[PDB]
Amino acid sequence: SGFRKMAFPSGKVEGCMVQVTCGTTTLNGLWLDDTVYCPRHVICTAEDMLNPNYEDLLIRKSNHSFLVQAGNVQLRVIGHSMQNCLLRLKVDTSNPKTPKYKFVRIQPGQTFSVLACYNGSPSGVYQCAMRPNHTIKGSFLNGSCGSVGFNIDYDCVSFCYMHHMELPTGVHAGTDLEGKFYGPFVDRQTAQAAGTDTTITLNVLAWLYAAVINGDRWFLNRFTTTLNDFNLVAMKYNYEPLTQDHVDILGPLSAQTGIAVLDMCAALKELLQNGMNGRTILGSTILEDEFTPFDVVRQCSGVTFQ
Amino acid sequence: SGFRKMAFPSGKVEGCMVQVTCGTTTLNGLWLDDTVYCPRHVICTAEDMLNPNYEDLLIRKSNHSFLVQAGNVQLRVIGHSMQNCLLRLKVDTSNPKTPKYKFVRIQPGQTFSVLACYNGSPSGVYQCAMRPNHTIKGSFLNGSCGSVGFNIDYDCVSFCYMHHMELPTGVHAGTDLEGKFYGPFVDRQTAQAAGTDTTITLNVLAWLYAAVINGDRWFLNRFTTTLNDFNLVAMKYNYEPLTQDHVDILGPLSAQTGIAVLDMCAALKELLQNGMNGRTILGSTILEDEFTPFDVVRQCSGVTFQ
Ligand SMILES: [Hg+2]
Ligand SMILES: [Hg+2]
């Protein structure tokens, strides 16, 4: 039946994207009810980049210093405030398309859909995982700031990311919808760089279970392993240590496939030590770590091929 | 800035998905204006699968034999007709959310976004390419028939695919929005199977240009090649033969990077003959062929890193 990195339908989020302008800078904003959210760096000018004092820069602005455009309509700003690294703009109109929603701060290793947007206009949607080093390997060009990340559950949109900048290695950093950065990054031009990253062990295991659910088990073996012995191998291949909590999480998938978690860990250990010998898993030649146990249960059939 | 397999925002299509029921079978339908489109096999029963005569099966149906549900609203069918492998249901209501649109039959190697849907409710969106063998490697489960594929250009949705079935190897087959199947497949239970497939050479080349545009050129070399000599190597690695037409298409990308097309072909030849030696391109360990020259120009910056 296949397995793809699929994102959530973006319709509910497309109806919330607007354009925010201050000075000569234009970027994206998120319009929910009568509030518009956007990166606070929309108020920076060329000489503010290296060491900006957003408090000082903001006090010098009025409500009309901000221009908010929704489609072909102009929204009047009737108030503004700064919440951490975000700007909260109050507008005279409540978004008619505001969906049921909430703000969530996702944890490292978890996934979400990103709606790439430019000038308040959505251009594409794709899935990505919050890396353990707190960055995401997205696809963003100039003008993409303000684009948001989200998950959708029973018609409720859980926003978890707003794009702010690109680091030296081409990876991206941002904040949650409360303006707090994911990772030790700050919104100013410095020498900051992404820290060392690691493979999301729990997700690789989830993915191996998806492969079995879809009918493939060539990588399994007759061995088992203890968490300790497994982590000795994981540490050598730069994989996150596996904990009992992660083992517990894999419970449902283990049950659906009849493959004990530690037995699957034994399979992973072998794959790491001997490689895949020209073979593929779910079409991949490498071990995928951008699918959480949740993502697998969501996309795969509830009935294993067997 | 990154490179991801990104799909088009699905909002405009989500507003067109409905549920169609006939007998005990329920699947997805596409609602545009006052017409609902869905796979004609929605009228098949267990004993019709092997050798169904849709003409005979359909004449036995009335307008009320069909149930169309849009969200929490029931649409009354006031007419029905069969167009090739599709059923065209006339309804008493015109879809208020019908976007500007058109029906297009895409060509092999081209890409489109798929909005996976179940019971008339969108569940996910992802990109895929129409393989040279006329199938797509999608992700579909029971109840996904009727899900559509599309591309979006300047607010105009070009529908190009409707899902009908899964073949033995787990790949998928469908029709364009005129009900004509892509490939030599038919909507009946038979021993039909996907034919031999090949790698989309033009797309791999497009992808290599994207890598250079993003700042990477470790795979380039000092050689060049003629189309003939290139195709001798391509034929050995099961790649589609490159034609002058394909060379012409790569013109813009060649110009933006300053790398002659045949020179890039020389690079590809080397990569095929010597492998990637543990190196990666745009994060991949293999040669990607699901990105068209159009997809690259769309996602990549217009300014090469250099
Ligand atoms: Hg700034
Ligand atoms: Hg049928």
Q: Which of A5, A123, A140 sits opposite B126 (nearest CB)?
A: A5
Look at B124 and A15 and tell me if their CB atoms are within 8 Å. no
Return the DSSP state at A10: -
User: A148 and A2 in one domain?
Assistant: yes
User: A223 and A296 in one domain?
Assistant: yes
Supply the range of the domain harboring residue A93. 15-99
Supply angle C-alpha A104, A107, A110, rounded to 5: 100
Look-up: residue for tokens 């890598």? B211
CB A25 within 8 A of CB A146: no
Say if strands B156-166 and B100-103 run parallel, antiparallel, or are unpaired.
parallel
Shortest alpha-carbon distance between residue B290 and chain A (Å): 13
User: B270 and B206 in one domain?
Assistant: yes
Rounded Cα gap, residues A138 and A170, in angstroms: 9
Q: Which of B9, B141, B172 sits opposite A14 (nearest CB)?
A: B9
Shortest alpha-carbon distance between residue A226 and chain B (Å): 31
B131, B91, B125, B90: which is closest to B109 by C-alpha? B131
Structural domain includes residue A306: no
B164, B106, B152: which is closest to B125 by C-alpha? B152
Look at B8 and A124 and tell me if their CB atoms are within 8 Å. yes
Q: Report CA Rg, chain B.
A: 22
Q: Give the orientation angle of helix A201-213 with respect to helix A261-274, to 10 degrees.
A: 100
Domain boundary residue among B197, B212, B242?
B197
CB B177 within 8 A of CB B158: no
> Under 8 Å CB-to-CB from A265, ≥6 apart: which residues?
A205, A224, A225, A227, A230, A242
CATH code, domain with B217:
1.10.1840.10
Q: Which of B5, B125, B170 sits opposite A9 (nearest CB)?
A: B125
Q: Give the resolution in Å.
A: 1.9
User: B132 and B122 in one domain?
Assistant: yes
Helix, strand, coil fractions of chain B, as percent rounded to 5: 25, 30, 45
Structural domain includes residue B306: no
Rounded Cα gap, residues B145 and B143, in angstroms: 6
Look at A5 and B9 and tell me if their CB atoms are within 8 Å. no
Rounded Cα gap, residues B228 and B249, in angstroms: 18
Amino acid, single-letter form, for residue B37: Y
**How far is CA A19 from its chain centroid?**
22
Residue A151 with chain B: CB contacts under 8 Å: none
User: B6 and B138 in one domain?
Assistant: yes
What tokens appear for A85 in the block? 């690294």
Q: Which SS3 state, helix, strand or coil, does residue B150 take?
A: strand
Beta bridge partners of A129: A111
Show which residues on chain A lie within 8 Å of chain B, measured between beta carbons. 1-12, 14-15, 115-116, 122-126, 128, 137-142, 166, 170-172, 214, 283, 285-286, 299, 301
Rounded Cα gap, residues A38 and A32, in angstroms: 12
Q: Report the C-alpha dihedral over residues A57, A121, B14, B86, rounded to 10 degrees.
A: -170
Domain boundary residue among A146, A176, A197?
A197
CA of B189 to the centre of ligand 2 (A): 7
Task: State the number of CA atoms in the 13 A half-sphere of A25 facing the CB.
Answer: 21
Backbone CA torsion sign across A177, A183, A186, A190: negative
Backbone φ/ψ region at A283: left (φ over 0), alpha (ψ -120 to 50), beta: left
Structural domain includes residue A173: yes
Residue B139 with chain A: CB contacts under 8 Å: 1-4, 6, 299
- Please name the method used to determine this structure: X-ray
Look at A116 and B6 and tell me if their CB atoms are within 8 Å. yes
User: B205 and B72 in one domain?
Assistant: no
Structural domain includes residue B203: yes
Site from A123, A139, A165, A276 to mutate, B interface, most B CB atoms within 10 angstroms: A139
Task: Give the nearest chain B residue to A12 (CA atoms).
Answer: B11
DSSP H helical ranges for chain B = 11-14, 54-59, 201-213, 227-236, 244-249, 251-257, 261-274, 293-299
User: A141 and A160 in one domain?
Assistant: yes
Residue A126 with chain B: CB contacts under 8 Å: 4-7
Site from B3, B5, B8, B10 to mutate, A interface, most A CB atoms within 10 angstroms: B10
CB A113 within 8 A of CB A8: yes
Helices (H) and strands (E) in chain A, counts: 8, 13
Rounded Cα gap, residues B155 and B24, in angstroms: 37
Distance linking the first and last C-alpha atoms of chain B: 14
Q: Which bound ligand lies closest to the C-alpha atom of B27?
A: 2
CATH code, domain with B166:
2.40.10.10
Show which residues on chain B lie within 8 Å of chain A, measured between beta carbons. 1-12, 14-15, 115-116, 122-126, 128, 137-142, 166, 170-172, 214, 283, 285-286, 299, 301
B42, B39, B7: which is closest to B26 by C-alpha? B42
Q: Which of B11, B139, B141 sits opposite A11 (nearest CB)?
A: B11
User: A191 and A44 in one domain?
Assistant: no
Active site residues of B: 41, 145
User: A114 and A72 in one domain?
Assistant: no
CB A300 within 8 A of CB B125: no
Q: Which long-range contacts (CB under 8 A, 24 or more apart) does B150-156 make?
A: B150/B8, B150/B13, B150/B112, B150/B113, B150/B115, B151/B8, B151/B104, B151/B106, B151/B111, B151/B112, B151/B113, B152/B8, B152/B9, B152/B12, B152/B113, B155/B12, B155/B99, B155/B100, B156/B99, B156/B100, B156/B101, B156/B102
Shortest alpha-carbon distance between residue B296 and chain A (Å): 12
CB A212 within 8 A of CB A259: yes
Q: Compute how many other C-beta atoms are within 10 angstroms of the C-beta atom of residue B245.
A: 8
What tokens appear for B89 in the block? 């249901």
CB A89 within 8 A of CB A27: no
DSSP H helical ranges for chain A = 11-14, 54-59, 201-213, 227-236, 244-249, 251-257, 261-274, 293-299
User: B137 and B84 in one domain?
Assistant: no
User: A72 and A29 in one domain?
Assistant: yes
Structural domain includes residue B45: yes
| Cα dist from B43 to B52, B53, B67, whole Å | 10, 10, 12
Look at A122 and B9 and tell me if their CB atoms are within 8 Å. yes
User: B84 and B29 in one domain?
Assistant: yes
Q: Report CA Rg, chain A.
A: 22
Structural domain includes residue B191: yes
| Cα dist from A262 to A225, A239, B305, whole Å | 6, 16, 46
> Under 8 Å CB-to-CB from B57, ≥6 apart: which residues?
B43, B44, B48
Look-up: residue for tokens 């890039």? B264
Beta bridge partners of A25: A22
Structural domain includes residue A211: yes
| Cα dist from A272 to A199, A266, B305, whole Å | 12, 10, 35
Q: Compute how many other C-beta atoms are within 10 angstroms of the C-beta atom of residue B65.
A: 14
Is A80 assigned a catalytic role? no
> Under 8 Å CB-to-CB from B86, ≥6 apart: which residues?
B37, B38, B39, B40, B162, B175, B177, B178, B179
Rounded Cα gap, residues B202 and B246, in angstroms: 6
Rounded Cα gap, residues A2 and B171, in angstroms: 7
List A85, A145, A160, A300, catalytic entry: A145
What tokens appear for B86 in the block? 């599709």
* Total domains in the fold of chain B: 3
A67, A40, A64: which is closest to A54 by C-alpha? A40
Q: Which of B3, B5, B15 sits opposite A11 (nearest CB)?
A: B15
Structural domain includes residue B269: yes
